[PDB]
A paper describes a structure:
Lamins represent a distinct class within the intermediate filament (IF) protein family. Lamin A (LA) and its splice variant lamin C as well as two closely related lamins B1 and B2 jointly form the lamina, a meshwork of ~3.5-nm-thick filaments located at the inner side of the nuclear envelope. Like for the whole IF family, the basic constitutive unit of the lamin filament is a rod-like dimer which results from a parallel coiled-coil (CC) structure. In line with this, the primary structure of lamins reveals a central α-helical domain responsible for the CC formation which is flanked by non-helical N- and C-terminal domains called the head and the tail respectively.
Crystallographic data for the LA 17-70-Eb1 fusion construct were phased by molecular replacement, relying on the dimeric Eb1 cap as a search model. The crystal structure was refined to 1.83 Å resolution. The asymmetric unit of the crystal contains two copies of the dimer that are readily superimposable. In line with the design, a continuous CC with regular left-handed geometry is formed all along the length of the chimera. Importantly, the structure gives a glimpse of the interface between the head domain and coil1A, as reliable electron density starting with residue 23 is seen in all four chains. The first α-helical residue is Arg28, which is in line with earlier predictions. Interestingly, the side chain of Thr27 stabilizes the N-terminus of the α-helix by making a hydrogen bond with the main-chain nitrogen of Gln30. First, residues 23 through 27 corresponding to the proximal residues of the head domain form a β-strand, facilitated by a Pro residue in position 23. Two such strands form a short antiparallel β-sheet, further referred to as the ‘β-lock’, which flanks the N-terminus of the CC. The second unexpected feature is that, consistently for both dimers in the asymmetric unit, one of the two chains reveals a sharp ~50° change in the α-helical axis direction (‘kink’) at residue Leu35.
Residue numbers in the entry:
A (entry chain B): 24 to 106
B (entry chain A): 18 to 106
Write the structure that this text describes.
């Protein structure tokens, strides 16, 4: 096929329409991406906060092993339990 | 050019006319593909991080309950642990 300048004009409009839709999708995905990066940073800060508490409790239990305290022994079993 | 005999072009001349626009479309399509993949990886990473938060939080809550249940002992070591549990920053 050889094509009219009018069919080209409509072909150009089609491409411009799809370009607008893909730009919208980029904007939506960039906003989502920014929110996910914030959420992972905040979640990792909570992990570090809680992990620090567990490490300090571990140190207190280790320092008091001489006491032979069954309550501290139960806490050590919680600290060292797997998932 | 008349309405009977309009200017008519090859699909190759059209390709060269539209090539710049098709190149810009390709930039945004590839950006969509890259961002969709990134976002899927981030959603998995947040699920795994939230599971670790729940795991550690469960340990802290269970230790809290044991400390509360033994408050009658007046044990300064348990009091140090409760200080850790209830401490900020």
């Amino acid at each position: 096929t050889r094509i009219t300048r009018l069919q080209e004009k409509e072909d150009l409009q089609e491409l411009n329409d799809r370009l607008a839709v893909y730009i919208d999708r980029v904007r939506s995905l960039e906003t989502e991406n920014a929110g996910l990066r914030l959420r992972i940073t905040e979640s990792e800060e909570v992990v570090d906060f809680y992990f620090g508490k567990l490490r300090n409790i571990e140190l207190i239990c280790q320092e008091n092993e001489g006491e032979n305290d069954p309550v501290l022994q139960r806490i050590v079993d919680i600290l060292y339990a797997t998932d």
